[PDB]
Amino acid sequence: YIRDGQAIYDRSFAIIRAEADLRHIPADLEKLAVRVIHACGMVDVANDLAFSEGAGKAGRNALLAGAPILCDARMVAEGITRSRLPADNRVIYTLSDPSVPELAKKIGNTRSAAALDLWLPHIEGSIVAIGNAPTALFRLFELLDAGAPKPALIIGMPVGFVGAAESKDELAANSRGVPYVIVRGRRGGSAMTAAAVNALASER
Amino acid sequence: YIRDGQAIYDRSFAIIRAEADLRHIPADLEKLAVRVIHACGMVDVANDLAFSEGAGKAGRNALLAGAPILCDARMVAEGITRSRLPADNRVIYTLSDPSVPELAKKIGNTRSAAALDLWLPHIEGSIVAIGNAPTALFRLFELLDAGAPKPALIIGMPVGFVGAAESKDELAANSRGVPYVIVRGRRGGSAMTAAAVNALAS
């Protein structure tokens, strides 16, 4: 077997490019697509990628500008490669704030959803990275409808069986004037979500 | 949309059980299968589950008995829910040891693989959780063949396009006397692996 970490790295990306149908992926999203596929082992995930026009450059440009990355889940945050960040970009995660549980109760939502209230000082021009909680995406919709400042990009890749597919479809159908990238259906998660951020963070 | 955490949690598992064909999944492994599905959102991942008979019981009992869990990747290690652990089980992750880059050059492997040398004092009766690096799994075979103490269970779920599929198939074909659970193919990753451990812990 290949015992060289760099060799292994380089090879997988090649094999992905050889095998994946990337015809409908614009240039500004080609690295993102390859990287998300890399994360999950499924070339057919590209079939399920959906996005706004220029969503890739929206994200790349924002990160260059020093935009923060707001993360719905600890594992998303943890998965972002700090060394790849072009501008000392803050990775923000609020779910573990002590005020969150009481919030959740008062606003009648999940803890994941309630945490977004703490994003507000940071949300303008941000990268929103949602890998785990449909209810965070759903809430976000409410905050935007209500006049919240707009992120530069929303990465909506929550995984699972309750609300996940639905939340992503809604984002695509009405993204409130915000650039978006999703993986349609039940697939997604922290690794794929981190991968997307990582792709847009560096030229590689 | 559903606004209650517990309800969301409960509902997903209900759907999974409803949709998944877990007929050929033994009792001792059902929760693991269901939790791996939950982690990845693919009912058909059950299609690719492989194991040694009784692997689920092997793992559960080890953890009950205070076995450590040895992880190839940071995210696998972080993915483990400590509160679920039944016996103050240690989660061992050695990749960040300062000695590792030198060890890698010295054995002429990857860093993820070199880190395994560090596992040796802890490997006996352990839960091995490999979720990222197939070179780790490959290296593990070398260590076993050289007569390392045997884990209680190897969970082999590395992801990717280079060696992942091969490394997992080798484990199934020759686990060196050690119980195993794998996800065949290119699929896997930290979330699935952590899910497997979490299932067995509680």
- Asked if A157 and A130 count as a contact pair (C-beta separation under 8 A), the reply is yes
Backbone angles phi, psi at B39, to 5 degrees: -75, -30
Amino acid letter, B57: K
Dihedral sign (CA B78, B200, B47, B49) = positive
Q: Which of B5, B162, B191 sits opposite A189 (nearest CB)?
A: B191
Q: How many Cβ atoms sit within 10 Å of the Cβ of residue B50?
A: 15
- Does A135 contact chain B (CB < 8 Å)? yes
- Asked if A98 and A39 count as a contact pair (C-beta separation under 8 A), the reply is no
- Does A103 contact chain B (CB < 8 Å)? no
Options A31, A38, A60, A139, the catalytic residue: A38
Q: Which of B72, B127, B135, B134 has its CA nearest to residue B107?
A: B135
- Asked if A176 and A150 count as a contact pair (C-beta separation under 8 A), the reply is yes
CA gap A126, A67 in Å, rounded: 5
Alpha helices (runs of H) in chain B, residue ranges in sequence order = 5-19, 27-40, 55-64, 74-79, 100-107, 111-114, 134-145, 164-173, 190-201
Contacts of B159 in chain A (CB under 8 A): 39-41
Q: Is A82 helix (H, G, I), strand (E, B) or coil?
A: helix
Which technique was the structure solved with, according to the deposited record?
X-ray
Measured CA angle at B53 (ends B49, B54), to 5 deg: 105
- Note whether B5 contacts A187, CB cutoff 8 Å: no
Measured CA angle at B78 (ends A69, B85), to 5 deg: 145
Please name each of the domains of chain B with its CATH number. 1-202 (3.40.50.10230)
Q: Is A177 helix (H, G, I), strand (E, B) or coil?
A: coil
Q: How many Cβ atoms sit within 10 Å of the Cβ of residue B24?
A: 9
Neighbouring residues of B142: CB distance < 8 A, sequence distance ≥ 6: none
E strand or H helix at A196:
helix A190-201
Q: Which of B185, B169, B38 has its CA nearest to residue A40?
A: B185
- Distance (Å) of CA A81 to CA A12, A48, A167, A204: 19, 25, 26, 12
- Distance (Å) of CA B119 to CA A189, B75, B171: 29, 17, 18
